[PDB]
Symmetry: T
Subunit: 146 residues, 12 copies
């Protein structure tokens, strides 16, 4: 069974804020469960992980080496600052798609640069949580073509 790994960077654990399930908002837990179940329904295994530091994220990326076939990652702020995470993804040779919930290009100039975009298979920005859904569909289509 092919495996996909979902990675979320700093502060993404805070999604939903106060009482998320009171007006249609959602937590990271909701998103992780949704993607995991959806991948399983298609016959694929999907693992997920979230952390607020480079060491934790890099260690998880290294752990995926030789057992994971595709990665979906929203690095959060590390998108703009982490050359170390870029190098971790390059070191394990696993294709990945970069996802951002908000439109980074519409925010501060320092968010217009990514240390992952140029080496990612593709990037989806500004479509909210649905962006993860599209990334999962693409990941599976890539795994099917092999």
């Amino acid at each position: 069974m092919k495996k996909i790994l979902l990675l979320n960077g700093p502060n993404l654990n805070m999604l939903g804020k106060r009482e998320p399930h009171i007006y249609g908002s959602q937590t990271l837990s909701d998103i992780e469960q949704h993607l995991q179940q959806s991948a399983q329904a298609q016959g694929y295994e999907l693992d997920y992980f979230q952390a607020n530091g480079e060491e934790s994220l890099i260690n998880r990326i290294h752990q995926a080496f030789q057992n994971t076939d595709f990665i979906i990652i929203n690095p959060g702020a590390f998108t703009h600052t982490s050359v170390a995470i870029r190098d971790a993804l390059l070191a394990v040779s696993i294709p990945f798609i970069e996802v951002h919930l908000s439109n980074v290009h519409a925010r501060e100039p320092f968010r217009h640069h990514s240390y992952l975009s140029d080496v990612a298979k593709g990037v989806i920005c500004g479509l909210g949580a649905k962006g993860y859904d599209y990334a999962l569909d693409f990941a599976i289509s890539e795994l099917q073509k092999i």
Copy 2:
């Protein structure tokens, strides 16, 4: 009924025409037909247009004013040069998603800048033709919220 407009910019008509294919045998027409059929199958209308110049593209955008509810656009090279198209999209106040077949961030540095990305609802880059399918899916989700709001 709600309507979606698919817009493709300069050189996109060359898809599938290059011999040593980059994406494959698929042509722009294949993508246009596929998206229109998918939209109609879901109860939505979808028009499509492609041109290699700003005037043609801008005139089509203006023509969409007050009759089109969402736009899916792959501006091609104009994403890096066209403030005119940016202003046309803003002038008609129709939300849009920017799509690119290739990963613009993996090419020349000048392709890293866009006059549309910051005002687009979202951007999908590097996922080939599938990118248009995701854009259509998102467009429909937005139109559904609009329809509900009109109730």
Copy 3:
């Protein structure tokens, strides 16, 4: 005789559509020029080819140009070169204050070669440009006299 050409760039045709429209401005300016004794032609287009062709057509028959290039102010070296090629003096006009918007709108490929620039005074900016254009043409007429 002595003729003036009003040129409006991309998206200006959308004025008052989303109360004064582009047509309202064009007709008003043309009538104002006529009352002052001058013939004013007008044209608007959303592309460089259409605009450049109109500029070329003005060569040798038009004496002054009033132009609001719209977004092309920031991108069109081609229109700059068209205006320079025909040697017709011009004033650049903008309805909104370009300096109060995004940084990329702070640069113009026309401002440095324009006789002058008027920005942020709405439609009245065109009236001032017309007044100046006429003053320049009067000097030309007397000079050839």
Copy 4:
């Protein structure tokens, strides 16, 4: 009886032989024209920020619109920008020459982004247009 204040910055007092018609000519012309329309127009010129800023502060609560050609200070004076913002009086920036056609340092202004509008390169007529606009704005109020 609304009031308009005309302000001219450094070196404008030298108009005439500086790189015809003097500043005095322009000031008289504008004052008389404003008066003919039923408006009062005061004018002032100085070569320093303290003098100009003090005049701007003095206009607070008694002046309805400002027409200003800050001269070289358009490119260097954040202080005058802040004085104009502090008194909350709408203003139009005027330049006799085309600043965009000169040295690169003259391409930037600390007033343009907060001015109601800017007129550059039309000589003294620029002041006439600024006055017409000022009056039109006051007629609205």
Copy 5:
């Protein structure tokens, strides 16, 4: 029969109507076509003031034209679209400019075409087109 396409961008139609002389764009087009044919080559020419017209002509040359000589005019500094059109049809080209672009404003120092052209000739007036044709033919002789 190998074919060469001469492309001229915005404002080139103003040549000889206003720097270089009485010679017009038509003069150059005819002269270059005559010279090409006299050497056993076919040459088409086209001029337009917009990206759409130029890009459409470039697409039309796909698979039937072997070399392009182009003076993009101002579009050399602004048109990524024309750059991509030339790359999409895979036809080698030489960029020509009558005036020396490096001796003018700083913004004319940048180009979206020069780095993908076979070569560039700038500042030699109308003779630049003659040299471009000579090079095109010499290159086609290789094949």
Copy 6:
């Protein structure tokens, strides 16, 4: 109730090796003297600092932070502070403007209530006074 959190970034534990502990204890002492509770924390990594910031969500009323080197590199910490919506003041013992150019930029300054730089340990004293004054207004 009236809770203030003092946060110190990487390398501040090396102070005097006054010491960091001297500063932490003095601010706690002064906060207590005015009827406020103050907690303090210091760490050398973003994960540890971000986790402490998240832990303060909805239970801490004001933050006093000297991010150390992270002032110039951590967008992640900026986002953690924005995520918890707790007002804060940025403090630096040394005058960052008098040091290398890369220290002239802060990812926190524009979203902080204010910044105090160059007054040594006294800067923390003033930051605490300000925090209390802000909380009394609310």
Copy 7:
């Protein structure tokens, strides 16, 4: 007896006119310093000449300066040089947070040579600056006794 000079730059005289005024701050600070045994003079002007002359006048008789240069923090190399010429330590104060405003307000010709900078804390910033100045002078005084 030690002396502190409070300097305020262009437009600060407009405080509370657009409820605390510049005068309120000046009087508050002077009263605070005097109550602690320190003399304090204050001055405000909208021009470089006036401010520079006042700075020169403080040479050899003033022990610390608290200055809110207003807009001149971003443009006045002349005031920077005046403060350096008289060798009097100073603290730069700003009511609003300059880092949260236009990019051009992010640069200062005084910050790098100031003892310290306080920005965005409102009028309280002046109080902290005064406290620091006095705390510094008190250490100097005790040092002189023990020397």
Copy 8:
């Protein structure tokens, strides 16, 4: 007959107060000029208005200017424009070497329009400027 104007900008009055003062330089230059049959006026101020007004006052009656604008060399477009307005040739002088200081002191709004610039030679810089000014007035 011919007249030279010596101008000094902000903070120059502090020279020798932190042995030779500004006064010593002003008096020395005036005496040297008068001894050579030339008239020389001098002025110093810490603001643009004062300096610009003195420059305007020299219009059509002063033949050469020697100016040490102090910090205004880096910030005053106004003084640049005042000197251009009166069309009087000038030499820019600086006691210290501006190029050896902070990067912001490497730019000048006067240097490109000055006849020449002398920097880093201390008070002697003013002597050389005076010598040049006189040689210029001699060929006219």
Copy 9:
């Protein structure tokens, strides 16, 4: 008994996994140093906190540091400050030539305060760094003897 600390940053643990491994290098350098009479400790981590904590722990007991910071050379002001805080001279080592890659790898927050930098010489770069560290310590020891 002088001591040298070998530090390796993010992703260095992947060496030879994509034949010589990081452990091969660590063991080799420790054996070489200790055969020369010098104690050598080694450590590797993928995060700033772990690396910084190890650097602080070296304070007052370590005489020289050999560090390949990995990607952190381009991003970590925090590690720069940790090394400066402990006042231990260090040599920066990189297996690949950082100047032959992307433009962003041309900048470092460590190179300007390092004793020296060795870049692009593969694993042997660590050997040269160790030789230099020992050379320095050997000159210091002889100096102490002759004094």
Copy 10:
């Protein structure tokens, strides 16, 4: 009579010497001889010189003062670094055409800047050895205009 001076800068002497060829068996000497023979056959004088340093090149430029009428120069790497050669060419007031075998715009960004291109009559880049032939053709046409004007 009119004279043309052909100047070649640093490393040009390596032409046709690299095992794997870049341009061909053609050497610097071949080009020098070809141009000199061509110029002479048309009735013009042509000197040629090549050196790897500024002093040698500048001295040759000074030597050309008042006796040379046009210069064809391939400055090699010095086009990006030599203000001294720029000033030498300006000091002698001899018009010149800058030539480069390879396309300087298709290489590293630092090669996009030149201290000579802005003051050259024209520039030819990327056409190999033929670039020199075109430069010679133009130079002779310019010299003919001068001779014609000599009445």
Copy 11:
């Protein structure tokens, strides 16, 4: 056999006025200690240095070069090294990154096999070790 060429640029002859000669002789000694031949050359101008590089074409296997000031200004020397296709290692006695900003850029670093900077004369020793190492994996 294998030949290595040591090149030193402008002003390096002023060393100690160890000396430049101390370094040249030490590398020659160490090269011969492993059966390799090593030539050395120093000059204060581009023409002299470039001519020596051209002279090494097809007879020299590796170059060790400290371009001195030319590291920051000479595109011509970069192109000479590329023209002769001889791999090289760049060396600097002082730490260029710790000096003026203009010394932070090198026209050789991106095309060199490696760079050693700030280790004084020993940097040359290591550069030689590397050169010999490279000539053996072959």
Copy 12:
């Protein structure tokens, strides 16, 4: 009796040779002779040298080591490009003054930067040949300080 070295860089030998005249009939040789005669008349020794390349100039600078007390140099275009000459001057520890005939700040933007001005005792630009006379006067005044 303490020696001064006058150094002139690339293209200075062209002085007084271009007919459409810029400075005048005066040549580089005239300035050299004039400055040397003046120095000697004041009880000082003065050597002069001019060359169009860095190697020639740097070698002359090195030769002045330990026998020359002050340098007057007009580096010509090398002021904008030669880090090598800057380092040669620093290596010999000889104080120098930089001189230029024309006003380098009134030309192209690239002429605003120098690799020599910041380490020179002072700079004189735009005063033509007179600048050399002032430089000599200053050099002597500095030597008298010793």
